[PDB]
Amino acid sequence: RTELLNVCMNAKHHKEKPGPEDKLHEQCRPWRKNACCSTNTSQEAHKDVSYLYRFNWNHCGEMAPACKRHFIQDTCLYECSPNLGPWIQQVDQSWRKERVLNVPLCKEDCEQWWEDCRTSYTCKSNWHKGWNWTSGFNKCAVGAACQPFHFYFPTPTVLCNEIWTHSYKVSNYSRGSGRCIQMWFDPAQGNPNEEVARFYAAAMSGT
Numbered sequence: 001r002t003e004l005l006n007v008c009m010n011a012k013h014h015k016e017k018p019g020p021e022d023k024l025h026e027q028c029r030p031w032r033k034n035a036c037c038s039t040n041t042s043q044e045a046h047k048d049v050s051y052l053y054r055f056n057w058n059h060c061g062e063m064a065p066a067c068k069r070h071f072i073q074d075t076c077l078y079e080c081s082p083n084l085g086p087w088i089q090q091v092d093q094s095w096r097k098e099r100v101l102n103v104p105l106c107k108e109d110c111e112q113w114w115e116d117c118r119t120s121y122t123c124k125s126n127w128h129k130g131w132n133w134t135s136g137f138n139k140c141a142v143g144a145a146c147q148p149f150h151f152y153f154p155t156p157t158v159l160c161n162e163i164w165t166h167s168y169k170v171s172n173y174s175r176g177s178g179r180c181i182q183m184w185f186d187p188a189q190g191n192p193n194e195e196v197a198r199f200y201a202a203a204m205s206g207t
């Protein structure tokens with residue numbers, strides 16, 4: 001891994017290389033200029049128990065729209081961003097050779113994500129391992145474990161870090177500091193992650 005900019009990780013769905021995709025679905029739209037995902041990938045992002053991972057958001061009763069939308073953006077960011085290089089690593093599992101680890105999510109993105117989920121419900125604090133997939137999609141391990149979302153994710157930083165086994169590492173930096181990744185941004189104002197990736201690829205450069 002010598003070049004960490006304008007590159008796609010090697011997971012279950014990514015393309016080999018970044019590239020224009022003017023047909024991306026609704027929330028994935030800000031990556032139409034340069035994406036790692038396909039029209040279909042972005043399309044399944046937005047759906048319940050998707051073709052992507054058969055993942056069930058409504059494992060603890062219906063998940064509130066205001067919350068689910070954040071998960072859809074995350075999915076977009078993970079499946080579409082070309083600027084995640086500096087945090088790519090190898091792990092070698094049955095469904096992805098590579099993945100991202102300790103992405104410095106902008107303080108607010110995390111807080112807002114945390115905030116919008118207050119009303120929703122979950123049963124696990126780790127959404128990568130532990131689900132009963134018998135049914136065809138992930139169901140609750142201990143069916144009676146269903147608690148308020150903030151019960152398993154007490155603070156924002158807990159949510160963003162632990163829910164995806166440390167794919168994020170919530171930065172102290174705020175949106176626009178040039179030092180953290182935004183999973184929400186206005187494409188009309190340009191892709192702010194492009195400068196963030198470039199910065200961090202230099203701070204860890206050489207050996």
Ligand SMILES: Nc1nc2[nH]c(CCNc3ccc(C(=O)N[C@@H](CCC(=O)O)C(=O)O)cc3)cc2c(=O)[nH]1
Pocket residue numbers: 053055074075078093094095099100127128129130131132133138164167168
């Ligand atoms: N930011 C960010 N978002 C992300 N979204 C996703 C999507 C990832 N969803 C899935 C989570 C769990 C499963 C699953 O079958 N688990 C098994 C064990 C999984 C395994 O080790 O083989 C279990 O329950 O025991 C499938 C998809 C990743 C991911 C990520 O890495 N980062």
